[PDB]
Structure formats: structure tokens, C-alpha cells
Design a binder for this molecule. Structure first.
Ligand SMILES: *[C@@H]1O[C@H](CO)[C@@H](O)[C@H](O)[C@H]1NC(C)=O
Ligand SMILES: *[C@@H]1O[C@H](CO)[C@@H](O)[C@H](O)[C@H]1NC(C)=O
Ligand SMILES: *[C@@H]1O[C@H](CO)[C@@H](O)[C@H](O)[C@H]1NC(C)=O
Ligand SMILES: *[C@@H]1O[C@H](CO)[C@@H](O)[C@H](O)[C@H]1NC(C)=O
Ligand SMILES: [Cl-]
Ligand SMILES: [Zn+2]
Lengths: 597, 98
């Protein structure tokens, strides 16, 4: 009779049929992913059409249900999650225009063709052309020309579509009762109805400012170190006191600096950490790799994998007999079913990726009994944060030697420690300032505080001081350089990377504290320690049924994200950087430009 | 079967708790609210039966399990059903017990 029971019945029924419908859709998707066939194309076409229609119909049906302040904070989150119709709140013509613009940008990004004037007909695309051209060759002129040509051929046409896309998203968020699209995206972290733990949308911005103001010192220290190294390499093209060029960062857009580790290696003669020779000697396969993974997670106490995964999933590539994608993906079929897309190779990298994915599946059945919509994290960050904490647990030298892959006689040395910490800092720590800056720029653009005539000028200015990098070629108002990025064109937020990194470092410190480890944090190992596994499972079992702040506070006891674990992790690196950069200039000048004469 | 064994049905929307050993077979239309639905089975009025299909790909803990329960009672009546006897093989021409 009462609306409470009505909502309960609606949610129960929706879960009951949505679990099987999503199982059907995911099995069609997997049959495609291991067998790329046209009938499978029709399969996910029909599956997605039916799923979208069904969810939209029940969203419209539940849009009328009264919200009579229902207790237990259980049906609420579900109904506010399913009540976001999206593009149907406004006229369907605008939704079709939005879909057309999305398709246009996706197709143009997938066809961002650039060709040289020497051979206009014979040229390479973005993938894997520029990646291999500039990830291996170090030709300054060629890299600069390729970067400039890519920007010219993308942004000059992508500027309008991006402008009306931002306008459409902002006005839809206003129709969705939001200040802008950025505030809509920040609404994922919003917590309401939990007194003493509610989180506001501006609280996230203030806290990210607070974290960045202590993240910075390591950032300019590594920036000074890489500037000195590149001056030693290329002094005639890079000023020792100015900002770096943006075309020598290893990747198109400054996401990672790992490609520059070889050029900036402190010791290029010491042997690197690698057991690929051990893999060749012992002929370990994916079966064995997942066997030691199951041993790892039995040692921590967590239930081992379901056998149906063993006799149902694919672990070895089938060759060219059937078409499949080699990109690592973990698929939650539902009903206790989980699958993997990978093309396994005999190396440490595939070892790490396989463990990362399988621990993703582990975290996924950590909340297996949870209802359908709650079979996820409170944000898009718990999944990869868990993946990275277990990756760091498996990557410690103690685990490497103990499992017999590395003989104890090799052990470890200070130079190897410096190399490993430098790789970790370049791969993970370096990404944070750039992602934060671009997310802040996107937030300002959505808020409308950035006029359309100031877009690229403020982009490059924030590059100059906030990021510390300059463009060597001037650009005019026709460009759309911010839209060059992958997920910008795919319309995906980037603060997930920063949140995931902070979460992974915090949980690494908390787990090592639970393991009572002393000394360096990178040497910390969690193997055969039941208390840490149980403490982690205590919150892993809840999933997203509780606010993210509450889940975070379960093990660390802290209400807010902190960078203290990162500083404790990189303190030896910080001391080494301080010792090395005593005679190295610190700071960057924004006014300096490579094109100045 | 590989496609789906949607041949079993099970109720989840009974008004109250079912009495033990009670049959409640009825093709009625459950109601969720105050409007007296007249069998339209549309909004806020759902069919009490839900899909109960199964597939071989399902993992442990969700695959179908056939279950049987045997009911016993001790009301006063002549013996009807009971177990057999030990039946030791016969021995002859010796002082034994029977
Ligand atoms: C992949 O699809 C083709 C055509 O649809 C089929 O002949 C083949 O058997 C399939 N492979 C597997 C492993 O099912
Ligand atoms: C919330 O509902 C669940 C099941 O519906 C129940 O087990 C739990 O006790 C409820 N919590 C509160 C605070 O009412
Ligand atoms: C998985 O754990 C169960 C529970 O102890 C155990 O019986 C089984 O042997 C384990 N599987 C493997 C492959 O060790
Ligand atoms: C877990 O137990 C094994 C068996 O004795 C032992 O070799 C291993 O060192 C233990 N784990 C740790 C972290 O010491
Ligand atoms: Cl840039
Ligand atoms: Zn992952």
C-alpha cells in the first residue's frame, strides 16, 4: 500500500530482470570480442537497443514515483541513479543532434589523418604511425613538425563541434538541474543524507587544491631534473632556464613520461629488473601465472577463483583462426561470471596486467551478492585503485625473490632502487599535475568563465606556469588543441586518474601498516598476511552500498584524501633529487618561447 | 540448455508469509499501492511470477540444483511404511538365535 513497498517491489523486479538482460548483452559482447563476426554485430545492436529502451521506459515510469523521504538510504540512491534520463529530458531533436556530433567527433578522431608533402598518397595514420615514429626516433625537427601538423589537421576543424558540444552539455546539465556539465560529473562524488560525512561538489575542488599544493614540490624537482637531462642531450633547442617543449614528452599529449626514462636513466649500465629469462627457462604459461595469482590471494585469505572461470574463459590466444581484440578487458557477465580479453605474451608486463585484471575480477565478486545497480564502485576509481595496490604488492622485490623467479643472490642495490623509484615517479606521479590542470580547464570552460577567444591562450599559459611546458610554434584562434585528447573526444572525465592514484597510494600505506611493515614502502609485501586481507575485505564486501568517504575511512581513519603516503613512498627519491639538483636550476620562465629570435 | 531454461516459475509477491505445507496456486495480479487494479497488470500492479531460467555457463552457487524433501509424521495409525531388516544369512544345524 505505502509507496515504500511500491519502490521496493519496483527495485526488486528491475534487478530480477536486469541481471539476466545484462548477462545476455555481455555474453553477446564477449562472443564478439573473441569472434568478430557480423552476426555478433547484429547481436550487440539488438542487445543495446533493447537494454536502452527498457531502461528508458522504466526511468520514465519511475519518474512519477513520490519521494516520501524513504529511510534506510537504500532505495534512494538506486532511484536517483535510475532517474537520470539524460538526453530525453529535453526535446529529442537536440538529443539526435548531440548523437550526430558525438559520432562525427568519434569518426574524425578515428580518422585523424596526417600525411607528409613529400609523399601525400603514402602516409601513416595516428595509430600506430605517430606513436612508433616519435616513441623510438628522437628527431627534433620531425617530432615538432608531426606535432604541429597533427594539431593543425585536428583542431582547425574540431573547434566548432567542440564549442557547440560544450554548450549543449552545459544547457542539458541546466535542464538536469546542474550549473554545468563539470558540476554534473562532480555530482558522482556527492554524498547527501549522511550527517557528519556529507561531501559537497566544491569540497572536491578545495581538497584537490589542498592535495596539489603539496604534490607540487616533487613535480618541479622532477621537471628540473628532466630539463637538465635534456639540456645535456639537446642544449641548442631547449633553454636551461625556460619551460620544456611539449613534443619531447614521449607521448602526443603529456600523459606519461615513462618513454623518457631511458634518456634520463641515472645509471644506464646496471642490469634492469626482469625475469623474462626465467619465464623462458621455466616455460610458465597463463595457467601457471593464474596459479600463482590464486596462491597469492589464498595467502591473504580471500576466497580463490571459481573453477567455472578456469574451464570457461580463454587464457591462450587462438592465432588468426578467429578475430579478437588484444586490448586487456575484464567483463562482468553477472550471475557470478567473469571473463578476460588479452593476448598473453611471455614477459613481466603481461604477468602484471594479468594479475591486475584478475584482481579486478576479485574486487568485482567482493560485492557479488549486491544487487545489480550496486555491482560497481561508488566512483570510477575503486576498480583501478585496487588493481594498482595489488600491482604494487606483486611488484615488490621481496615478492619477486620469494616466489623463486629471482634468485636471492641478486637481492637489490641503491642504484636499482633509484631506477625503480624514478620509473614509478615518471609513470604515476608525473601524470597528476597535467590531469588536474586539464580537468580544471574543462571545469572553467563548462562554467563559462573562459571566453571562446581566450581558450588556447589560457591553455598555453597554464601549460607555461602550472604545468611548466611551452609550445614551440605559435597558434591562432582556429585551433581546438584541448579536444585533441582521446577521452576529451570520447567525453570522459580525467579526475578519475588523480583520484585513483591518491586512493592507491593511501590504501597501499594503510595495507602496509596493517602488515606491520617497516622501512621503504616499495619493498612492502602483502603475501601471506591474513589480517590485512580481512581488513581490506571488510570494506570490499560493501562495494558502493556506502558513500566513498565512509569506505575510505574504514581502513585509514581519515576523512579526506592525503598525500602523506606518497611523500613517505618517495622520500628517498626526494632526498636523491635534492642531492642531485643542488647545481641544477629550479623553476620555469613562462615568457620564454622556443620560437623567439 | 545453452539458450535458457525458462521453464520454471517462482512467486515473490505474496501478500504475507505463507503457511507451511500450504498451496497458494493462483494466477492473480499483485498490487503495489492503493488503486484497485482489475487485472490490467500494468503500472504498480505486477505479475507475481518471475523468470527462473538457467544456463550451463553460470558459475558455482547459481547453477540449478534439484532438491527433494521427505515429510515424516507419527500420528496414531497402523504401520504403513518402514525400513527392512538386517537379514543375516541363515545358518543351520547349530545353536543359534532367530
Ligand atoms: C566464429 O564465428 C565463425 C562464423 O560465425 C564460426 O564459423 C566459428 O566457429 C566461430 N568460432 C568459435 C570459436 O565459435
Ligand atoms: C535496510 O533494509 C535491509 C533489507 O531491506 C535491512 O536488512 C536493514 O536492516 C535495513 N536498515 C535499516 C536501517 O532499516
Ligand atoms: C580453492 O579453495 C578451496 C577452499 O579451501 C579449496 O578446497 C580448493 O582446493 C582451492 N582450489 C585450488 C585450485 O587450490
Ligand atoms: C607465508 O608462509 C610461508 C610458508 O612457511 C613462508 O615461506 C612465507 O615466508 C610466509 N610469508 C611471509 C610474508 O613471510
Ligand atoms: Cl598541449
Ligand atoms: Zn584496470
Amino acid at each position: 500500500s505505502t509507496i515504500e513497498e511500491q519502490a521496493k517491489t519496483f527495485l526488486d523486479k528491475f534487478n530480477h530482470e536486469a541481471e539476466d538482460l545484462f548477462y545476455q548483452s555481455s555474453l553477446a559482447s564477449w562472443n564478439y570480442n573473441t569472434n568478430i563476426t557480423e552476426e555478433n554485430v547484429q547481436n550487440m545492436n539488438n542487445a543495446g537497443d533493447k537494454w536502452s529502451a527498457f531502461l528508458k521506459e522504466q526511468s520514465t515510469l519511475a519518474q512519477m514515483y513520490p519521494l516520501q523521504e524513504i529511510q534506510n538510504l537504500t532505495v534512494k540512491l538506486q532511484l536517483q541513479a535510475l532517474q537520470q534520463n539524460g538526453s530525453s529530458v529535453l526535446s529529442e531533436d537536440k538529443s539526435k543532434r548531440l548523437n550526430t556530433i558525438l559520432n562525427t567527433m568519434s569518426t574524425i578522431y578515428s580518422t585523424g589523418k596526417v600525411c607528409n608533402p613529400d609523399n601525400p598518397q603514402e602516409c601513416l595514420l595516428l595509430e600506430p604511425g605517430l606513436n612508433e615514429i616519435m616513441a623510438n626516433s628522437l628527431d627534433y625537427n620531425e617530432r615538432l613538425w608531426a606535432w604541429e601538423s597533427w594539431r593543425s589537421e585536428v583542431g582547425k576543424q574540431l573547434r566548432p563541434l567542440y564549442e557547440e558540444y560544450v554548450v549543449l552539455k552545459n544547457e542539458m546539465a541546466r535542464a538536469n538541474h546542474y550549473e554545468d556539465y563539470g558540476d554534473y560529473w562532480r555530482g558522482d562524488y556527492e554524498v547527501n543524507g549522511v550527517d557528519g560525512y556529507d561531501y559537497s561538489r566544491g569540497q572536491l575542488i578545495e581538497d584537490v587544491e589542498h592535495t596539489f599544493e603539496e604534490i607540487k614540490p616533487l613535480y618541479e624537482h622532477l621537471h628540473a631534473y628532466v630539463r637538465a637531462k635534456l639540456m645535456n642531450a639537446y642544449p641548442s633547442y631547449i633553454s636551461p632556464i625556460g619551460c620544456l617543449p611539449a613534443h619531447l614528452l614521449g607521448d602526443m599529449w603529456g600523459r606519461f613520461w615513462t618513454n623518457l626514462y631511458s634518456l634520463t636513466v641515472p645509471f644506464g649500465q646496471k642490469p634492469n629488473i626482469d625475469v623474462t629469462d626465467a619465464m623462458v627457462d621455466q616455460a610458465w604459461d597463463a595457467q601457471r601465472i593464474f596459479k600463482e595469482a590464486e596462491k597469492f590471494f589464498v595467502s591473504v585469505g580471500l576466497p580463490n577463483m571459481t573453477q567455472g572461470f578456469w574451464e570457461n574463459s580463454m587464457l591462450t590466444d587462438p592465432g588468426n583462426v578467429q578475430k579478437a581484440v588484444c586490448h586487456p578487458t575484464a567483463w562482468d557477465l553477472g550471475k557470478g561470471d567473469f571473463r578476460i580479453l588479452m593476448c598473453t605474451k611471455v614477459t613481466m608486463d603481461d604477468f602484471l596486467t594479468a594479475h591486475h585484471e584478475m584482481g579486478h575480477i576479485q574486487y568485482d565478486m567482493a560485492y557479488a551478492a549486491q544487487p545489480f545497480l550496486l555491482r560497481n564502485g561508488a566512483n570510477e576509481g575503486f576498480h583501478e585503485a585496487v588493481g594498482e595496490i595489488m600491482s604494487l604488492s606483486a611488484a615488490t622485490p621481496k615478492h619477486l625473490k620469494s616466489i623463486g623467479l629471482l634468485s636471492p643472490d641478486f637481492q637489490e642495490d641503491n642504484e636499482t632502487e633509484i631506477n625503480f623509484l624514478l620509473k614509478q615517479a615518471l609513470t604515476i606521479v608525473g601524470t597528476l599535475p597535467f590531469t588536474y590542470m586539464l580537468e580544471k580547464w574543462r571545469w572553467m570552460v563548462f562554467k563559462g568563465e573562459i571566453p571562446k577567444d581566450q581558450w588556447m591562450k589560457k591553455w598555453w599559459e597554464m601549460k607555461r606556469e602550472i604545468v611548466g611546458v611551452v609550445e614551440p610554434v605559435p597558434h591562432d584562434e582556429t585551433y581546438c588543441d584541448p579536444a585533441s585528447l582521446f577521452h576529451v573526444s570520447n567525453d570522459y572525465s580525467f579526475i578519475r586518474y588523480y583520484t585513483r592514484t591518491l586512493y592507491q597510494f593511501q590504501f597501499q600505506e594503510a595495507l602496509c601498516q596493517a602488515a606491520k611493515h617497516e622501512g621503504p614502502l616499495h619493498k612492502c609485501d602483502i603475501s601471506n598476511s591474513t589480517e590485512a586481507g580481512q581488513k581490506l575485505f571488510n570494506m570490499l564486501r560493501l562495494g558502493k552500498s556506502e558513500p566513498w568517504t565512509l569506505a575510505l575511512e574504514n581502513v585509514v581513519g581519515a576523512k579526506n584524501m592525503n598525500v602523506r603516503p606518497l611523500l613517505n613512498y618517495f622520500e628517498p627519491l626526494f632526498t636523491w633529487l635534492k642531492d642531485q639538483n643542488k647545481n641544477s636550476f629550479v623553476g620555469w620562465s613562462t615568457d620564454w618561447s622556443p620560437y623567439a629570435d | 540448455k545453452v539458450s535458457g531454461n525458462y521453464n520454471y516459475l517462482y512467486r515473490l509477491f505474496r501478500k504475507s508469509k505463507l503457511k507451511p505445507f500450504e498451496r497458494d496456486i493462483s494466477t492473480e495480479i499483485y498490487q503495489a499501492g492503493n488503486k484497485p487494479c482489475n487485472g490490467v497488470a500494468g503500472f504498480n500492479c505486477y505479475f507475481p511470477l518471475q523468470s527462473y531460467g538457467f544456463r550451463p555457463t553460470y558459475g558455482v552457487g547459481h547453477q540449478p540444483y534439484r532438491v527433494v524433501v521427505l515429510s515424516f509424521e507419527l500420528l496414531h495409525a497402523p504401520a504403513t511404511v518402514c525400513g527392512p531388516k538386517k537379514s543375516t544369512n541363515l545358518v543351520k544345524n547349530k545353536c543359534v538365535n532367530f
